Design an enzyme around this catalytic site. Sequence first.
Site, PDB file in Angstrom:
ATOM      1  N   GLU A   1       4.999  19.959  -6.541  1.00 27.28           N
ATOM      2  CA  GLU A   1       5.976  19.619  -7.597  1.00 27.28           C
ATOM      3  C   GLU A   1       5.678  18.246  -8.263  1.00 27.28           C
ATOM      4  O   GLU A   1       6.200  17.936  -9.345  1.00 27.28           O
ATOM      5  CB  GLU A   1       7.411  19.649  -7.037  1.00 27.28           C
ATOM      6  CG  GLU A   1       7.739  18.483  -6.115  1.00 27.28           C
ATOM      7  CD  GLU A   1       8.907  18.766  -5.174  1.00 27.28           C
ATOM      8  OE1 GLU A   1       9.858  17.948  -5.131  1.00 27.28           O
ATOM      9  OE2 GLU A   1       8.858  19.790  -4.455  1.00 27.28           O
TER      10      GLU A   1
ATOM     11  N   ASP B   1       3.203  11.005  -1.199  1.00 23.33           N
ATOM     12  CA  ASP B   1       4.105  12.113  -1.574  1.00 23.33           C
ATOM     13  C   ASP B   1       3.361  13.139  -2.435  1.00 23.33           C
ATOM     14  O   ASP B   1       3.896  13.669  -3.412  1.00 23.33           O
ATOM     15  CB  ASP B   1       5.339  11.575  -2.320  1.00 23.33           C
ATOM     16  CG  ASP B   1       6.521  12.566  -2.343  1.00 23.33           C
ATOM     17  OD1 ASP B   1       6.561  13.500  -1.507  1.00 23.33           O
ATOM     18  OD2 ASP B   1       7.424  12.392  -3.197  1.00 23.33           O
TER      19      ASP B   1
ATOM     20  N   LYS C   1      15.232  14.771  -7.136  1.00 24.53           N
ATOM     21  CA  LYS C   1      16.357  14.208  -6.386  1.00 24.53           C
ATOM     22  C   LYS C   1      17.122  13.182  -7.219  1.00 24.53           C
ATOM     23  O   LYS C   1      18.357  13.231  -7.320  1.00 24.53           O
ATOM     24  CB  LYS C   1      15.869  13.562  -5.088  1.00 24.53           C
TER      25      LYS C   1
ATOM     26  N   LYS D   1      12.061  10.112 -18.204  1.00 23.79           N
ATOM     27  CA  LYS D   1      12.605  10.321 -16.860  1.00 23.79           C
ATOM     28  C   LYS D   1      13.864   9.482 -16.673  1.00 23.79           C
ATOM     29  O   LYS D   1      13.782   8.268 -16.622  1.00 23.79           O
ATOM     30  CB  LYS D   1      11.551   9.968 -15.789  1.00 23.79           C
ATOM     31  CG  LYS D   1      12.030  10.069 -14.320  1.00 23.79           C
ATOM     32  CD  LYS D   1      10.854   9.938 -13.320  1.00 23.79           C
ATOM     33  CE  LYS D   1      11.313  10.039 -11.859  1.00 23.79           C
ATOM     34  NZ  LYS D   1      10.156  10.006 -10.885  1.00 23.79           N
TER      35      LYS D   1
ATOM     36  N   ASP E   1       4.719  10.977 -10.023  1.00 25.15           N
ATOM     37  CA  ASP E   1       5.810  10.584  -9.104  1.00 25.15           C
ATOM     38  C   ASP E   1       5.365   9.566  -8.044  1.00 25.15           C
ATOM     39  O   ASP E   1       5.250   9.907  -6.860  1.00 25.15           O
ATOM     40  CB  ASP E   1       6.421  11.813  -8.405  1.00 25.15           C
ATOM     41  CG  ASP E   1       7.777  11.511  -7.745  1.00 25.15           C
ATOM     42  OD1 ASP E   1       8.211  10.333  -7.742  1.00 25.15           O
ATOM     43  OD2 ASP E   1       8.418  12.445  -7.212  1.00 25.15           O
TER      44      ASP E   1
ATOM     45  N   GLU F   1       3.774   9.834 -20.013  1.00 25.71           N
ATOM     46  CA  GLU F   1       2.894  10.829 -20.623  1.00 25.71           C
ATOM     47  C   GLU F   1       3.462  12.252 -20.386  1.00 25.71           C
ATOM     48  O   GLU F   1       3.877  12.578 -19.264  1.00 25.71           O
ATOM     49  CB  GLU F   1       1.477  10.688 -20.046  1.00 25.71           C
ATOM     50  CG  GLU F   1       0.529  11.853 -20.304  1.00 25.71           C
ATOM     51  CD  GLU F   1      -0.828  11.694 -19.594  1.00 25.71           C
ATOM     52  OE1 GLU F   1      -1.029  10.688 -18.866  1.00 25.71           O
ATOM     53  OE2 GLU F   1      -1.690  12.594 -19.750  1.00 25.71           O
ATOM     54  N   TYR F   2       3.511  13.070 -21.442  1.00 20.08           N
ATOM     55  CA  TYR F   2       4.004  14.454 -21.341  1.00 20.08           C
ATOM     56  C   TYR F   2       2.867  15.375 -20.870  1.00 20.08           C
ATOM     57  O   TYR F   2       1.758  15.313 -21.407  1.00 20.08           O
ATOM     58  CB  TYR F   2       4.585  14.907 -22.702  1.00 20.08           C
ATOM     59  CG  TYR F   2       4.734  16.420 -22.942  1.00 20.08           C
ATOM     60  CD1 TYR F   2       5.464  17.234 -22.073  1.00 20.08           C
ATOM     61  CD2 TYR F   2       4.182  17.016 -24.079  1.00 20.08           C
ATOM     62  CE1 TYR F   2       5.619  18.604 -22.316  1.00 20.08           C
ATOM     63  CE2 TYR F   2       4.331  18.385 -24.332  1.00 20.08           C
ATOM     64  CZ  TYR F   2       5.043  19.166 -23.453  1.00 20.08           C
ATOM     65  OH  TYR F   2       5.179  20.514 -23.714  1.00 20.08           O
ATOM     66  N   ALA F   3       3.137  16.184 -19.842  1.00 15.83           N
ATOM     67  CA  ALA F   3       2.152  17.122 -19.293  1.00 15.83           C
ATOM     68  C   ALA F   3       2.516  18.530 -19.746  1.00 15.83           C
ATOM     69  O   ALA F   3       3.452  19.131 -19.215  1.00 15.83           O
ATOM     70  CB  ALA F   3       2.119  17.043 -17.769  1.00 15.83           C
TER      71      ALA F   3
HETATM   72  N1  LIG Z   1       5.513  13.931 -17.508  1.00 15.15           N
HETATM   73  C1  LIG Z   1       6.037  15.159 -17.253  1.00 15.15           C
HETATM   74  N2  LIG Z   1       5.719  16.250 -18.001  1.00 15.15           N
HETATM   75  C2  LIG Z   1       6.243  17.468 -17.715  1.00 15.15           C
HETATM   76  N3  LIG Z   1       7.113  17.698 -16.702  1.00 15.15           N
HETATM   77  C3  LIG Z   1       7.500  16.683 -15.876  1.00 15.15           C
HETATM   78  C4  LIG Z   1       6.958  15.337 -16.112  1.00 15.15           C
HETATM   79  N4  LIG Z   1       7.492  14.519 -15.180  1.00 15.15           N
HETATM   80  C5  LIG Z   1       8.303  15.281 -14.410  1.00 15.15           C
HETATM   81  N5  LIG Z   1       8.297  16.569 -14.814  1.00 15.15           N
HETATM   82  C6  LIG Z   1       9.091  17.660 -14.187  1.00 15.15           C
HETATM   83  O1  LIG Z   1      10.246  17.046 -13.606  1.00 15.15           O
HETATM   84  C7  LIG Z   1      10.175  17.081 -12.168  1.00 15.15           C
HETATM   85  C8  LIG Z   1      10.625  15.784 -11.491  1.00 15.15           C
HETATM   86  O2  LIG Z   1       9.883  14.630 -11.919  1.00 15.15           O
HETATM   87  P1  LIG Z   1       9.593  13.491 -10.801  1.00 15.15           P
HETATM   88  O3  LIG Z   1       8.944  12.351 -11.565  1.00 15.15           O
HETATM   89  O4  LIG Z   1       8.732  14.202  -9.786  1.00 15.15           O
HETATM   90  O5  LIG Z   1      11.080  13.147 -10.284  1.00 15.15           O
HETATM   91  P2  LIG Z   1      11.544  12.756  -8.774  1.00 15.15           P
HETATM   92  O6  LIG Z   1      11.134  11.322  -8.576  1.00 15.15           O
HETATM   93  O7  LIG Z   1      13.049  12.873  -8.793  1.00 15.15           O
HETATM   94  O8  LIG Z   1      10.857  13.772  -7.883  1.00 15.15           O
HETATM   95  C9  LIG Z   1       8.736  17.415 -11.834  1.00 15.15           C
HETATM   96  O9  LIG Z   1       8.665  18.074 -10.560  1.00 15.15           O
HETATM   97  C10 LIG Z   1       8.354  18.289 -13.021  1.00 15.15           C
HETATM   98  O10 LIG Z   1       8.896  19.604 -12.841  1.00 15.15           O
HETATM   99 MG   LIG Z   2      10.520   9.712  -7.254  1.00 15.01          MG
HETATM  100 MG   LIG Z   3       8.847  14.423  -7.669  1.00 15.91          MG
END
Ligand SMILES: Nc1ncnc2c1ncn2[C@@H]1O[C@H](COP(=O)(O)OP(=O)(O)O)[C@@H](O)[C@H]1O
Ligand SMILES: [Mg+2]
Ligand SMILES: [Mg+2]
EC number: 2.7.11.1
Length: 265
Positions: free
Chosen positions: A134, A130, A17, A36, A148, A85-87
């Site tokens: 995702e 939450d 979002k 991010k 998140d 951290e990268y996943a």
């Molecule tokens: N550390 C990460 N490594 C790999 N993919 C990520 C990582 N963080 C986020 N993502 C991808 O980006 C999306 C959104 O990140 P998120 O932190 O959940 O944002 P939001 O707060 O807007 O939901 C995740 O659902 C995932 O698909």
């Molecule tokens: Mg968020």
């Molecule tokens: Mg999220």
Amino acid sequence: QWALEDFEIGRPLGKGKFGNVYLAREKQSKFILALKVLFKAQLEKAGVEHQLRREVEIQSHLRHPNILRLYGYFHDATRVYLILEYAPLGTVYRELQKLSKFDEQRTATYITELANALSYCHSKRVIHRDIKPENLLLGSAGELKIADFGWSVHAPSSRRTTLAGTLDYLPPEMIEGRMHDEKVDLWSLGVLCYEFLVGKPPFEANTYQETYKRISRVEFTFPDFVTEGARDLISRLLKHNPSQRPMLREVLEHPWITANSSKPS
Ligand SMILES: Nc1ncnc2c1ncn2[C@@H]1O[C@H](COP(=O)(O)OP(=O)(O)O)[C@@H](O)[C@H]1O
Ligand SMILES: [Mg+2]
Ligand SMILES: [Mg+2]
Ligand SMILES: CSc1nsc(SC)c1CO
Ligand SMILES: [Cl-]
Ligand SMILES: [Cl-]
């Protein structure tokens, strides 16, 4: 300290979002990470500055193998940047879309890792609120990591912010705007266990209004292939009254979990 000039940006990892998440490499160390990016105009318009601060504060202090690390942050007058951290194996969401359903061993292993991470969180009276596919990422050895923490808080709590998207993972007390505590995450754990085994969450419905109705009444049924042990665990977690939901030690000790999981407590 850190600024944008310190990083080379790569491909998009995902969108949320507010979150626009990119692969990146720090120039001097060649360290690979996830960046991010949030837009200040959008944060200000929606009034969610406090959520972002909570996210940085809570997540940077936690240290657990099944929780994603936050290393730091910086900003530049239009954007805010979280250094994560990268996943490398992506989201549980993506894995579920690929395979349609998980088998009992995969599901019980994920539930064990979740319960471990949540147990660590709850011991500091941190509730996530939450938990959904995702926001669950996968490490290099395929291990689950919670991410998140933007909705996370200290218990007990009310809700001061408008519910954005899906109601599918939220318990009755949260959607009814009532008071809640740690047990909200146990309800979500129940919803996830059902979705992992069945391929869709138990209160899913075509409209907001009807999903609300099914959650408040706890109306769900099981397909025939769901076994007796899974049904017992899920039914214990999806109790309308929070105090009747099991403790995380009980989940980790449940006979169906111990029989099928490939990880320990
Ligand atoms: N550390 C990460 N490594 C790999 N993919 C990520 C990582 N963080 C986020 N993502 C991808 O980006 C999306 C959104 O990140 P998120 O932190 O959940 O944002 P939001 O707060 O807007 O939901 C995740 O659902 C995932 O698909
Ligand atoms: Mg968020
Ligand atoms: Mg999220
Ligand atoms: C955690 S740093 C943070 N949270 S919200 C905002 S709004 C600009 C900032 C940047 O000062
Ligand atoms: Cl409150
Ligand atoms: Cl809130």
